[PDB]
């Protein structure tokens, strides 16, 4: 009595006996190839923050650009597709003087994202005012009137009597989100050339600003004239530039801003909760896939394991292994 | 595949097949959590944290790779060991049916 075999050797590895030649094997791995990214099967995969917001970038949405507001769909899974997000309209920003470009990437790390419907503070009667709220032709609103970012209020002195230089003024930014949510407060400051600074604010020297929230302090000094070229903006010439920053207010805490002339006071504020699973990828998402792999894109789990470039991945994925593993499917080989 | 000398033992042949099938299914249905980015750590702002996160991913992938390799090695151990168990079970049947009048070589 006995057992038939293919009479051909195939080496496998065992736990206590080392390598053994057997009659047959089943390979357990493949090497994937690179292709486009896709929707993750079983999820709504977040690419753009507001896909219905047409002709808007993620940073446009994060700053509240006019015509770029609306609901941000929740998502348990998100794709980081811009290492350095850009704007595509509104008033010219000197982006790289702060961390502001990362704001939409910070937002996509949360599952739930929404812009507050209340103003966190009243801009017109803020310290150092009263102020009229500045608007710009670079930022056309729904009926094409002059507007501005919904997250901020351009504070311009309303009365010539108070149109003067000011000592640093402190404003408290309260927490207006729902308990459990993080609040991300967007603020900044406008600057211009020397004569336009005198006309707008009654002072043409550099202005200074600080923010402070949860023990995190920042400090900025403005620039008067000699600005870099306008970029990523509304395409309309402007003599001035704005600097924009964000501060994260955690666990229901109040933040503070100290400011002088040109302050962009916060208005609408981001409220975010939960956690979204994020990997790097590229748009557009084409079709669907079992798995999203940072190096291979969308892929489908044909076998339980894979060899090749290990990387961050999400979904129903094959597991990275070091060697092409083989399951034994036969008897011990003996030379015939 | 299993038999005597010619006739094939259907159940002994079949149960050897199922043993390899159970091992394949067991290895195919392992659940291992995946690795994604930190939601809070931003590029440029938190590069030092991101370097440690990359180190954590690299060490985790190596650990899981060794763990799955051992699982395959343990599966192959039981499969290769089962050949001797099947043969011994085939000899016990040729000794129970063939009475003591026969002698085993």
């Amino acid at each position: 009595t006995g057992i038939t075999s293919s009479n051909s050797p195939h080496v496998v590895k065992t736990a206590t006996q080392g390598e053994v030649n057997v009659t047959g094997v089943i390979p357990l791995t493949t090497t994937p190839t690179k292709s486009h990214f896709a929707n993750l099967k079983g999820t709504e995969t977040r690419g753009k923050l507001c896909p219905k917001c047409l002709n808007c970038t993620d940073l446009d949405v994060a700053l509240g650009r006019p015509k770029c507001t609306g609901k941000i769909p929740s998502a348990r899974v998100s794709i980081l597709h811009e290492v350095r997000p850009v704007t595509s309209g509104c008033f010219p920003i000197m982006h790289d003087r702060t961390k502001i470009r990362q704001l939409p990437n910070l937002l996509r790390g949360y599952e739930h994202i929404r812009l507050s419907t209340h103003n966190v503070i009243n801009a017109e009667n803020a310290p150092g005012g009263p102020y009229k709220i500045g608007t710009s032709g670079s930022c056309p609103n729904i009926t094409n009137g002059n507007g501005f970012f919904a997250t901020m209020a351009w504070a311009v002195p309303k009365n010539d009597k108070n149109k003067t230089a000011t000592n640093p003024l402190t404003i408290e930014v309260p927490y207006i989100c729902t308990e459990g949510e993080d609040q991300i407060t967007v603020w900044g400051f406008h600057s211009d050339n020397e004569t336009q600074m005198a006309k707008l604010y009654g002072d043409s020297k550099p202005q200074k600003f600080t923010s402070s929230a949860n023990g995190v302090t920042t400090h900025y000094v403005s620039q008067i004239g000699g600005f870099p070229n306008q970029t990523e903006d509304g395409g309309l010439p402007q003599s001035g530039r704005i600097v924009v920053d964000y501060m994260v207010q955690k666990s229901g805490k109040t933040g503070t801003i100290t400011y002088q002339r040109g302050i962009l006071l916060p208005q609408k504020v981001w409220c975010a909760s939960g956690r979204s699973k994020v990997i790097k990828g590229s748009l557009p998402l084409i079709g669907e896939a079992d798995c999203l792999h940072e190096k291979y894109g969308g892929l489908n789990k044909s076998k339980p394991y894979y060899t090749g470039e290990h990387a961050k991945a999400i979904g129903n994925c094959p597991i990275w292994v070091k060697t092409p593993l083989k399951l034994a499917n036969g008897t011990k080989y003996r030379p015939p | 595949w299993h038999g005597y000398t010619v006739a094939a033992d259907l159940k002994s042949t079949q149960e050897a097949i199922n043993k390899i099938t159970k091992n394949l299914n067991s290895l195919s249905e392992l659940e291992v959590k995946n690795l994604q980015r930190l939601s809070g750590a931003m590029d440029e702002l938190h590069n030092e944290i991101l370097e440690l996160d990359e180190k954590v991913d690299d060490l985790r992938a190596d650990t899981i790779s060794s763990q799955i390799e051992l699982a395959v090695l343990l599966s192959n151990e039981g499969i290769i060991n089962s050949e001797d168990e099947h043969l011994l079970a085939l000899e016990r049947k040729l000794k129970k049916m063939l009475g003591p009048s026969a002698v085993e070589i």
Partner: nanobody
């Protein structure tokens, strides 16, 4: 008593399209992968396209990507192979196969064909003017 039954084959012109169906009796296709194969007379059976228990696709040969698509309907208990832009060389008997082994994954053509515990009787596709 379990059985797969292919249908939809027949004569079609080059550049034409044809939709084959793989219906199951005596068992359900849920949680199983279903792979399509084809065979030219005198040649070994070759893999075409498989759909996993999750509904995702695994192509068994590179050439057929694009032209061949696949879908499954758990209510209809049926898998469909959609063939477009057919060439004369696509003439063959087309088979579907399934199994409970391998975690409902598609594997590759060689391994899945060996894993298959059920094969349909095949349907003839003939591509000619």
């Amino acid at each position: 008593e379990v059985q797969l039954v292919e249908s939809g084959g027949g004569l079609v012109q080059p550049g034409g399209s044809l939709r084959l169906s793989c219906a199951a009796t005596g068992f359900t296709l849920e949680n199983k992968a279903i792979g399509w194969f084809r065979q030219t007379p005198g040649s070994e059976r070759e893999g075409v396209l498989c759909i996993s228990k999750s509904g995702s696709w695994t192509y068994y040969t590179d050439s057929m990507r694009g032209r061949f698509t696949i879908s499954r309907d758990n209510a209809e208990n049926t898998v469909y192979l959609q063939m477009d832009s057919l060439k004369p060389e696509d003439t063959a008997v087309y088979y579907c196969a399934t199994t409970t082994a391998g975690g409902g994954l598609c594997w590759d053509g060689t391994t899945f064909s060996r894993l298959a515990s059920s094969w349909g009787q095949g349907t003839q596709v003939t591509v000619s003017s």
